[PDB]
């Protein structure tokens, strides 16, 4: 089916939190008694890159960002139907910019009246491969609408082992979604201590820390899986290959603070079966920006200056988006640069277990009876 799904999140309806305001006006309360009917010996071809359900969540989040962070100047392109000097003049919009609170909330996409949602339960699932432990439900699990690049933040973890998912390997175009089985933490702060606005005619500085003794374990398992796909080549990580500032670096949000964290001291290491890092607090240098590029279409934007102080992001890291650099010049190597940017790929890593199906009840079969006439 190609239907719409009503959301169902546990709101509050009293605080000035943005997601609590949005969830109260368009969401219902969560199901207090869920029922997961386990089917028998069934098999369903769960394709995940052709899932139309993720095309809906992406259009239900864009409608939230137009109710949350109103830009001061929303510069967006607009062309005129003239064959080819095509008339393409920008159309700016000036709106009030109030600094509002910002925090995601887990939502649940539920099936409408008359349809059902299937769900695989295999601990591997492979992506677009048919599983066997298919069970039906009515609402998905907790899904957070976190918007980020190069590192999938807050969310669900793998069941037993770090699995990799990609629509098609060896074609270096499709992004490789890597799901972790252990929550890698990350803390990002800037207390006060940097009220220095300009330098010559810092408040635009922040940092993050990653537990090196814990992060190497999860990275050590990723290379163990990637080498299973390429045993003779060499796994060599690298930084980004350039482009827009929202892709070259990490990018997440915390109360309107658009942290653009430089992730070069996290992917610089070359690899083999042994380590090449060192031998606790990896200082991930970040920077608050003001002129961004929207992820909800082409076009720049400009927000209000940052808050005075005490900006904290006690996050998690459940996924990882990695691209691949192949070719005829690939002399026994494997380059996995950080990618991401396509937010649909951010939610396909979350909505991979589900599928919306309808029940057709007719059926025709041959038999040995005959209508007496």
């Amino acid at each position, epitope marked *: 089916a190609t239907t719409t799904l009503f959301c169902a999140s546990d709101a509050k309806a009293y605080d000035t939190e943005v997601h609590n305001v949005w969830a109260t006006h368009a969401c219902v309360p969560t199901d207090p008694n869920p029922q997961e009917i386990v089917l028998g010996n069934v098999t369903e071809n769960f394709n995940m890159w052709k899932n139309n359900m993720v095309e809906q969540m992406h259009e239900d989040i864009i409608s939230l960002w137009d109710q949350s962070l109103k830009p001061c100047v929303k510069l967006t392109p607009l062309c005129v139907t003239l064959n080819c000097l095509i008339n393409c003049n920008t159309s700016v919009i000036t709106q009030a910019c109030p600094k509002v609170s910002f925090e995601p909330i887990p939502i649940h996409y539920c099936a409408p009246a008359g349809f059902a949602i299937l769900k695989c339960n295999s601990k591997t699932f492979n992506g677009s491969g048919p599983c066997t432990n298919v069970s039906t439900v009515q609402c998905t699990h907790g899904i957070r609408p976190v918007v980020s690049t190069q590192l999938l933040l807050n969310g669900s973890l793998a069941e037993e082992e770090i699995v990799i998912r990609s629509e098609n390997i060896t074609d270096n175009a499709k992004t490789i979604i890597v799901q972790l089985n252990e929550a890698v933490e990350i803390n990002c702060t800037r207390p006060n201590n940097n009220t220095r606005k300009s330098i010559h005619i810092n408040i635009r500085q922040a940092h993050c820390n990653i537990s090196k003794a814990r992060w190497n374990e999860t990275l050590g398992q990723i290379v163990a899986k990637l080498e299973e796909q390429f045993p003779n080549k060499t796994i060599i990580f690298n930084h980004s290959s350039g482009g827009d500032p929202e892709i070259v670096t990490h990018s997440f949000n915390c109360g309107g603070e658009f942290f653009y964290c430089n992730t070069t001291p996290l992917f610089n290491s070359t690899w083999n079966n042994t380590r090449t890092d060192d031998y606790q607090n990896i200082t991930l240098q970040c920077r608050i920006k003001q*002129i961004i590029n929207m992820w909800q279409g082409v076009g720049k934007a400009m927000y209000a200056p940052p808050i005075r102080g005490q900006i904290r992001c006690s996050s998690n890291i459940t996924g990882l988006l990695l691209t691949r650099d192949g070719g005829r010049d690939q002399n026994g190597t494997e380059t996995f640069r950080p990618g991401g940017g396509n937010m649909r790929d951010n939610w396909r890593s979350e909505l991979y277990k589900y599928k919306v199906v309808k029940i057709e009840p007719l059926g025709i079969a041959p038999t040995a009876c005959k209508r007496r006439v």
Partner: antibody
Amino acid sequence: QVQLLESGAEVKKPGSSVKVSCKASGDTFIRYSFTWVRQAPGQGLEWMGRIITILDVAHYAPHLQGRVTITADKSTSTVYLELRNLRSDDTAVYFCAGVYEGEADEGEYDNNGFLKHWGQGTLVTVT
Amino acid sequence: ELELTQSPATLSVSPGERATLSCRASESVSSDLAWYQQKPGQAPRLLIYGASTRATGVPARFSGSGSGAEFTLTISSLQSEDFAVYYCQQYNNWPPRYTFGQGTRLEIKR
């Protein structure tokens, strides 16, 4: 570091179009915004408008939007002020005004609404 | 729109005396007020920005404070070159709809 250079003091009959230019140096033209303040003889400081160099946007007063427009030719680093539909009340002294913004190209923009750097003033008079 | 009101029309001072000024807004406004100087036929040099931070080159003789509606200013050890017209220009509305202020001036006994 930055400097300004106004245009020539030209008088025009009320009803025509007026163009005022301002060049600069010392810093890249797209690093910070620019404004316009109207100095009438014996009056205060009337605010004409404001233009961002990167985002070619402009905001004006509600009694001037049908007569002014600002462009920032970054290839020549010279802001222009096409003031058409000239009247008699518009006899004043026009001049550019800038204020630095820390690294707007990379995105460290500040939205400094005050004014620090000023030009010298061109004389605009109707007859 | 908004309006900035000054209490005096001119300011009776003398060299070596302290001078104070105040700006009142027609509506509420935060600490986004800047004080401007003005000399005849010169460029209106910036004095304070944000009502509590001096510019690059403003001496310690000029200072001010206040928030909300009242915005004070103080001039310690009034020099000879400090006799110039002062101005108040508010900027706290997005889109920019701020207009102007009245302004004061120091006096000369004659």
